Amino acid sequence: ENRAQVAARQHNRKIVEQYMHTRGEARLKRHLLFTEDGVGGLWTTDSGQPIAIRGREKLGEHAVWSLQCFPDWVWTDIQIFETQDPNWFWVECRGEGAIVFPGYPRGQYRNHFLHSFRFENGLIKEQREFMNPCEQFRSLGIEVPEVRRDGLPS
Template sequence: MVDITGTAETTDTFSRSHSDAELRASNRAIVEQYMNTRGQDRLRRHLLFTEDGTGGLWTTETGQPIVITGRDRLGDHGQWSLKCFPDWVWTNIEIFDTQDPNQFWVECDGEGTIRFPDYPDGHYRNHFLHSFLFENGKIKRQREFMNPCQQFRALGIAVPEVKRADIPT
């Protein structure tokens, strides 16, 4: 096989690229499964993670991420999430491969009921980015990014206005 420079690839290079393609396809299928898991099936989503895997929300009102560490704790988080977001769905899911067969990005929308203690139930929708890092066919790290102001609105929390005078739009 000849690469883009016209140089013949070695068997090792071809083998590695072939195994990278297989690894990427396998990991991508897990990302698809994660993003399309709904209802009670969300209680088993933590099984897609490594034993020491992490997941969480990287955009919060504190400026600090909420990180859940360990497969068992991610299982606990799944129970909490199902209670607080009982009918949550991801839609308009676009999965992006990277140069690394173990790294993926997802852009999507999310929508459903939000039930946080101390707030009235609301309908929450937002736009999200997710990052997935894999290790040995399992999710090692999952990070979620969103606009916290949309969550504030769904909870009935007033969002301050930033005056951006003269910004060209």
């Protein structure tokens, strides 16, 4: 059993590395790292609900939009964490690039990210990314509310 778990973790780690280093036109094929029913998306948004992309085919379609809205995106400072589950990895990283959202001025977006990767039969079953949406608001020129801190320790 341990030999099967070690083998799974070593293989899955390679897929995480491949995912995090996928850049440029290769992003059009990143959905091939998922199971057919795999899910990916952004779990931290202004609405409080994830923006989840369901299915390898929808993931491929999203990559088209991704390359338009984030045309030179790179992940940096990548740290991959294996876990006691050979099929579950976490990644801490930063990400940066131009942001070209419909109806907003072109901007530069930089943020800190956590990624969750869960695997099934050698491919990604669920990818989730977590960030602070306030930094994306800033990149789009959107005003960020400020919690008043006068009454708080400083």
